[PDB]
Amino acid sequence: ESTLGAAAAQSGRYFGTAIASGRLSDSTYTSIAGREFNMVTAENEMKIDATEPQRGQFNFSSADRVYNWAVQNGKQVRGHTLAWHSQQPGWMQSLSGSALRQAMIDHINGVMAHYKGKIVQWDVVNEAFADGSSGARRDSNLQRSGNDWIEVAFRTARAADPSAKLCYNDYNVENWTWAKTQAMYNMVRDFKQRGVPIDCVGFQSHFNSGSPYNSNFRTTLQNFAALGVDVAITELDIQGAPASTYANVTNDCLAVSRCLGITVWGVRDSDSWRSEQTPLLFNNDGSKKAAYTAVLDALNGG
Ligand SMILES: O[C@@H]1[C@@H](O)[C@H](O[C@@H]2CCNC[C@H]2O)OC[C@H]1O
């Protein structure tokens, strides 16, 4: 096949991108993204602050611009994200304890109701683990509300939209030997033992010199799949966009039956949150980089 999404679809997978609503007037952006991807994540518009800028007062305008663009262009949508320490609106940042817990639940219920039946995967909880050697939970208002915040978010989501696949998403959890990875593994294992409703694990896959790709990513993906969850590569970007690493990651997904697909975190290098690291598949002018060709060839089986 001639495009990433179509090539992925031949093996039953998707190839997605992050979409920014403010860029939906950019003809190069929309035409390349339209052609190449069959899955969309809103880069910012489905986050807590965007969707609930005042408590109880939802604003889906920008989110729906992304959603509607996706489905008008034949893509499915991953919802990102319902419960996270970052990009909280001010009103939620000030809450703690039981009041925060109620607001977290209310936010999940309101957003999922708006999209009920329409979104195939939700990143219900994002980035709950600390970096480094401890495997501890990240300090946040949510974590301070109790260790059960994650499980409660998942149980809330399962009740709100039983059709959605519920994902836990994080970064620096790709290398099988890292403490953070093992913390996430043991959480998912615990959730499956205690009946907590988790369907998928998202590996953000932000690879760079401080958190480099390792061939053991395939092992990580296999081992999580064996716990009885799907796995997905959710926010892939790679410092310098080396073709070799991009091919390795693609082949790791293709090797694991329950790897649903790959999303890259943007279209052109200049669209990237980390543009200075030139970490994506298209040049600033929209042309294909060497890494594009390596991914397409891997998806096509040679
Ligand atoms: O525009 C930027 C987004 O790309 C960025 O997205 C996060 C990358 C790290 N993982 C979670 C994602 O939501 O969020 C910051 C924003 O400024």
Question: Residue 255 sits in a domain of what CATH number?
Answer: 3.20.20.80
For the chain, the domain total comes to 1
Type of residue numbered 227? L
Judge whether 114 and 85 are in contact, CB under 8 Å.
no
Q: Is residue 246 packed enough to be buried (19+ CB in 10 Å), middle (13-18) or exposed (0-12)?
A: buried
Pocket lining: 44 vs ligand 1, CB cutoff 6 Å: yes
Our answer to whether residue 127 is catalytic in this structure is: yes
What's the rounded Cα separation, in Å, for the pair 194 and 18?
A: 33
The closest of 173, 86, 186 to 132, measured between CA atoms, is 173
Report helix, strand or coil for 41. strand
Burial 187-213, CB ≥16 within 10 A → b, else e: bbeebeeeebbbbbbbbbbbbeeebeb
Catalytic residue, from 43, 127, 151, 174: name it. 127
Catalytic residue at 45? no
**Which residue lies with its CA nearest to atom 17 of ligand 1?**
273
Q: DSSP letter at 137?
A: B
Contact by Cβ (8 Å): 195, 39: no
The pair phi, psi for residue 249, each rounded to 5°, is: -65, -45
Strands (E) across 105-191 are located at: 121-126, 165-170
CA torsion sign, 249 to 254 to 258 to 260? positive
Name 268's bridge partners.
Answer: 282
Range of the domain at 192: 1-302
Identify which of 214, 213, 170 has the alpha carbon closest to the alpha carbon of residue 188: 170
**252 touches ligand 1 (CB under 6 Å):** no
Q: What's the CA angle centered on 39, arms 34 and 43, to 5 degrees?
A: 90
Residue whose pair of structure tokens reads 């000030």 in the numeric block: 94
In angstroms, the CA 82 to CA 147 distance is: 17
